[PDB]
């Protein structure tokens, strides 16, 4: 049931045993998957009804699906300074002399 | 370290090896008294010698002849009869015959390098096979 | 049980209530251990409310 927790705050549409559909934002679920939906709209065959905060029973629920993503360094020791390149008179690798 | 007559009795396997440890202690005392014939650091070389030898004796007791119980061996290390760090070095590959522990650490050298004794003789020239100044060591490397 | 230093018996009794403590918790001072046990056993003071 860990996956079910991942659906918190997502927007959900739930088909019911009646056949209606509630769409809204999930607030909290249950062991019997009682759902709490905020800002809920009703889909009665399509007719629109504002419901608001709605608690669905576990038995009433048939299926559910998501419709939207959930609403959503300190420092370092580095310091820069301009400088030029100094040409050496040698042509040899560092190890070899 | 020092044990009284009323102290807790050492484990069972101690008494048969007690006399030779006593001999080690006796000669350590003699080396303390013995003076002369060396520079400021050469006179202190035989100390490490005997110390390594004593620790090697205990190491030989456990790991090569299993003549002592594990309880007695932990007791011996806890009573400083052996150097735990030196034995730990002896238990890893490349340091089977380590002389002492000052010839492995690089913070005590001028140029941040180990001692000459740690170096295999095959890559060392014939002329520079000299006695270590730290402990008189004549070759630590496991190859030799 | 909390005071009298009975770790195993107290642990078993709390396990029966599904109250689970970390092993380092039984080795606490008597008074903070009492507070921890009482806060796990009797949660929010809902009786007063």
């Amino acid at each position: 049931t860990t996956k079910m927790v991942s659906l918190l705050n997502h927007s959900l549409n739930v088909t019911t045993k009646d056949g209606r559909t509630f769409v809204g934002q999930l607030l909290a679920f249950d062991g019997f998957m009682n759902l709490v939906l905020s800002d809920c709209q009703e889909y009665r065959h399509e007719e629109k009804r504002m419901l608001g905060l709605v608690i669905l029973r576990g038995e009433f629920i048939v299926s559910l699906s998501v419709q939207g993503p959930p609403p959503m360094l300190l420092s370092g020791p580095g310091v820069a300074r301009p400088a030029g390149r100094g040409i050496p008179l040698g042509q040899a690798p560092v190890g070899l002399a | 370290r020092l044990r009284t007559s009323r102290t807790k009795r050492p484990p069972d396997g101690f008494d048969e090896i007690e006399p030779t440890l006593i001999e080690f202690q006796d000669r350590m005392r003699q080396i303390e008294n013995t003076m002369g014939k060396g520079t400021k650091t050469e006179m202190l070389a035989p100390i490490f010698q005997l110390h390594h030898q004593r620790s090697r004796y205990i190491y030989d007791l456990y790991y090569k002849r299993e003549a002592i119980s594990t309880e007695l061996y932990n007791w011996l290390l806890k009573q400083n009869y052996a150097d735990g760090n030196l034995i730990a070095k002896w238990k890893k590959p490349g340091y089977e015959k380590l002389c002492c522990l000052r010839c492995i650490q690089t913070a005590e050298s001028k140029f941040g390098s180990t001692c000459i004794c740690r170096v295999p003789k095959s890559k060392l020239d014939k002329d520079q096979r000299v006695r270590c100044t730290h402990c008189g060591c004549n070759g630590c490397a496991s190859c030799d | 049980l909390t005071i009298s230093d009975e770790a195993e018996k107290l642990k078993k009794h709390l396990s029966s209530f599904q109250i689970y403590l970390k092993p380092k918790d039984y080795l606490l001072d008597p008074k903070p251990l009492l507070q921890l046990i009482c806060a796990s056993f009797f949660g929010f003071p809902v009786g007063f409310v």
Binding site: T16, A28, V36, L53, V54, F60 | - | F44, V46
Partner: protein
């Protein structure tokens, strides 16, 4: 459980709920249980067809509930973490 906690939160407000019949009830919630049995006052029942009646005191059994329309300002009710043994979602101060 958080859902029954919210249902308990609702008591004293006006909540609308519909049962397995299809009738919707509009009244003041006065009691609630873990089974979601509800006690109501001043109910205005709207039947499935549309007939409107009135009731004074009812004790609706929980098993015959489809959903409830909780008042909106309970959206900010706190959802507390529930341990294994705890049966009521409450603020915690012990281990968990």
């Amino acid at each position: 459980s958080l859902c029954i906690k919210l249902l308990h939160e609702t008591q004293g407000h006006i909540v609308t709920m519909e049962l397995e019949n299809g009738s919707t009830y509009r009244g003041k919630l006065i009691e609630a249980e873990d089974n979601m049995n509800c006690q109501m006052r001043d109910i205005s029942v709207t039947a499935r067809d549309g007939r409107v009646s009135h009731l004074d005191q009812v004790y609706i059994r929980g098993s015959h509930i489809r959903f409830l329309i909780v008042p909106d300002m309970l959206r900010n009710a706190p959802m507390f973490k529930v341990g294994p043994g705890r049966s009521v979602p409450l603020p915690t101060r012990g281990r968990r």
